[PDB]
């Protein structure tokens, strides 16, 4: 029944007292006497110690030690001694898992046994696959029928100049295996030209959906996935805004169609105006920018890892999240369930 | 002078009227009449056209065409035809969308020198973005060797690279991806302030080395004296951090506003020091990658001059377990012990 202070906890004198911990859990305790007491109790858990054994080394009243212990424990600043038993390649992720009160070995085991479909292997698919690969996802299935170009080299970090002309899935698989040879990687030569094509995509723990062709691709994927009982996550960008979510979970979350948050590009009343709309939109080419692609891909992968690891809530559950690049701004669009929805409702 | 409609533009019927543009510049036009006149005007510029030519081509009054043309132009939805004129031809749409001539931005990047001070997770991600964007010269600074544990974040590294020098492998991986650039190596960790004088002059330093603990304090003081721009990037466990972007004589410095509490009474301060010395960051690739991506965006913008970097006078945090972004003011201070 040992507890141990997590390596990821730091403290600092600040204001009238001090700070405890770093990151989201960072707490500012105003009282100096309380803060110093928290330091004293945490010091007693540097070595794996039971409450009683640590208390025996404390020079503070037991009621105080008890409240600090409770403070430290609820925030996962101290964890079960066993959670620290590991040299392993995934060790740095372990402190992250510990910090959320999870058993590192258990999260890792859930990842090993996971199967993830990368639907679209462009800039998003590249960054997501490599995050998932090097974090220990057991099986990654790459789906794309495109070929590598020279213009790809901006965001598609796995690809090199010599890769031009080769299949995307082929080079990603190669580049993933060189990073994590312990995992299984397959590839499926398919682009979704029609809704029907979706039937060729295998079942998995989740689909990572980032292909943007055709323009209503996410509408197809959603409809299909609702009917197939298949979890998926969308990620991409709308020029300078990084976008990730929703993360659809059958029966637990809203689908893409529920809230009707995005406008349908092509379509008006007047034909004269409608033709022009359709031509302007048909010539659309996104203003790609690695930093935007990278943010979108990174937060998407974090959500997949938490979805499968089960240690913290995915951010994009019931939400489509945007992060700006030309201003300091983050916005989430509501995508919770609608009983009225014609796709997943009634 | 011809004008052309940017390919990054898109529109959609929405609400009372419709939306013009994608991303940051997206504007809901409520008045359907106005929304329609914007598309009619924009339609004339799909293929390059002069103002006057398009005016006759458009089936709308001169007074409306003027306002609509102005709207499109002020938003860089339509740009000078010459701006439409490659490897980096993907980043060109991005620069156009900010009203910059992409060729002249690209030229600035080719003429730039960037120091990557620390080649861990952040240095890996920053360096590859800058390289593939066409930053002309990159100076890689690190003395550590690749460990298997690195592979989780440090995206340029593979299982076969374990044991080799980080600087060495980044360099090879960079040249594989962009052969048009030049990369430099300096085998050096900053364990002593004086090691900074071995760090060359550059357009900007990307600083992400996390040891010693007061590294950013050594960089701050040195860069002020050296009139050297720098940007710090990293993370506080699960929070991604980038900024400040220090610009000599324009911004505050790290020390100015004192936004951070230093890590390091007889009994307690010995215990604090003991705890903090055992500290290891709870690293996580998604967090690493965000800080790095936005760091890189700011360097590109700082050098490219086409848009204001976000981290001027600001230290910015993005949470990963909450939907949250927060910046801390790093405005200039006359009482600062470094640049007051």
């Amino acid at each position: 029944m040992d507890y141990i202070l997590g390596r990821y906890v730091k403290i600092a004198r600040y204001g009238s007292g001090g700070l405890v911990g770093g990151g989201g859990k960072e707490q500012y305790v105003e009282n100096l006497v309380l803060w110093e007491n928290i330091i004293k109790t945490a010091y007693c858990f540097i070595t794996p110690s039971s409450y009683t054994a640590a208390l025996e080394t404390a020079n503070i009243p037991e009621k105080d030690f008890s409240n600090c212990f409770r403070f430290l424990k609820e925030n996962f600043f101290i964890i079960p001694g066993e959670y620290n038993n590991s040299n392993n390649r995934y060790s740095r992720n372990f402190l992250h898992y510990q910090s959320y009160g999870a058993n590192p070995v258990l999260v890792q085991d859930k990842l090993k046994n996971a199967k993830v479909v990368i639907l679209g292997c462009g800039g998003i698919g590249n960054h997501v696959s490599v995050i998932l690969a090097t974090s220990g996802i057991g099986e990654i299935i790459l789906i794309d029928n495109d070929q590598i170009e020279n213009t790809n080299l901006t965001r598609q970090v796995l690809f090199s100049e010599d890769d031009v002309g080769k299949n995307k899935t082929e080079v990603i698989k190669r580049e993933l295996l060189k990073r994590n040879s312990e995992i299984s990687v397959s590839e499926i030569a398919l682009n979704i030209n029609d809704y029907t094509d979706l039937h060729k995509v295998p079942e998995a723990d989740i689909w990572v959906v980032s292909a943007d062709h055709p323009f209503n691709l996410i509408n197809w994927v959603n409809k299909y996935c609702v009917r197939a009982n298949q979890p998926y996550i969308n990620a991409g960008y709308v020029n300078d805004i990084a976008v990730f979510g929703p993360l659809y979970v059958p029966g637990k979350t809203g689908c893409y169609e529920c809230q009707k948050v995005v406008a349908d590009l092509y379509g008006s009343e007047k034909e004269n105006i409608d033709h022009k709309i359709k031509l302007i939109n048909s010539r659309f080419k996104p203003a790609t920018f690695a930093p935007v692609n990278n943010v979108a891909a990174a937060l998407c992968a974090a959500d997949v890892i938490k979805f499968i690891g089960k240690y913290s809530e995915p951010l994009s559950l019931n939400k489509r999240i945007g992060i700006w690049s030309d201003e300091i701004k983050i916005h989430s669009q509501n995508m919770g369930r609608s009983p009225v929805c014609s796709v997943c409702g009634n | 002078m011809d004008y052309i409609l940017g390919r990054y533009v898109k529109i959609a019927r929405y609400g009372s009227g419709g939306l013009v543009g994608g991303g940051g510049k997206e504007q809901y036009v409520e008045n359907l009449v106005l929304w329609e006149n914007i598309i009619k005007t924009a339609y004339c510029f799909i293929t390059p056209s002069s103002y006057t030519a398009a005016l006759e081509t458009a089936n709308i009054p001169e007074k409306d065409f003027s306002n609509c043309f102005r709207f499109l132009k002020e938003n860089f939805f339509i740009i000078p035809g010459e701006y439409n004129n490659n490897r980096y031809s993907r980043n060109f749409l991005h620069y156009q969308s900010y009203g910059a001539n992409p060729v002249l931005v690209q030229d600035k990047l080719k003429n730039a020198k960037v120091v990557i001070l620390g080649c861990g997770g952040i240095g890996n991600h920053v360096s590859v973005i800058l390289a593939t964007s066409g930053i002309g010269e990159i100076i890689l600074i690190d003395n550590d060797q690749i460990e298997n544990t690195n592979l989780t974040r440090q995206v340029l590294f593979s299982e076969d690279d374990v044991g080799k020098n980080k600087t060495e492998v980044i360099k090879r991986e960079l040249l594989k991806r962009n052969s048009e650039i030049s990369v430099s190596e300096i085998a050096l960790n900053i364990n002593d302030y004086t090691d900074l004088h071995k760090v060359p002059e550059a357009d900007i330093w990307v600083v992400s080395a996390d040891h010693p603990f007061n590294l950013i304090n050594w960089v701050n003081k040195y860069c002020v004296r050296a009139n050297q721009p720098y940007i710090n990037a990293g993370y506080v466990n699960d929070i991604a951090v980038f900024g400040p972007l220090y610009v000599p004589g324009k911004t505050g410095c790290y020390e100015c506003q004192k936004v951070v509490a230093d890590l390091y009474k007889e009994n307690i301060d010995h215990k604090i020091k003991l705890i903090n010395s055992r500290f290891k960051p709870a690293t996580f690739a998604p967090v690493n990658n965000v800080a790095a991506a936005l760091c890189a965006a700011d360097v590109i913008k700082f050098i490219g001059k086409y848009s204001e970097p976000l981290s001027l006078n600001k230290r910015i945090g993005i949470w990963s377990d909450e939907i949250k972004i927060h910046s801390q003011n790093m405005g200039r201070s006359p009482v600062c012990s470094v640049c007051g």
Partner: peptide, 7 residues
């Protein structure tokens, strides 16, 4: 964001 410098 306040507990020490960035890592």
């Amino acid at each position: 964001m306040r507990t020490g410098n960035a890592n």
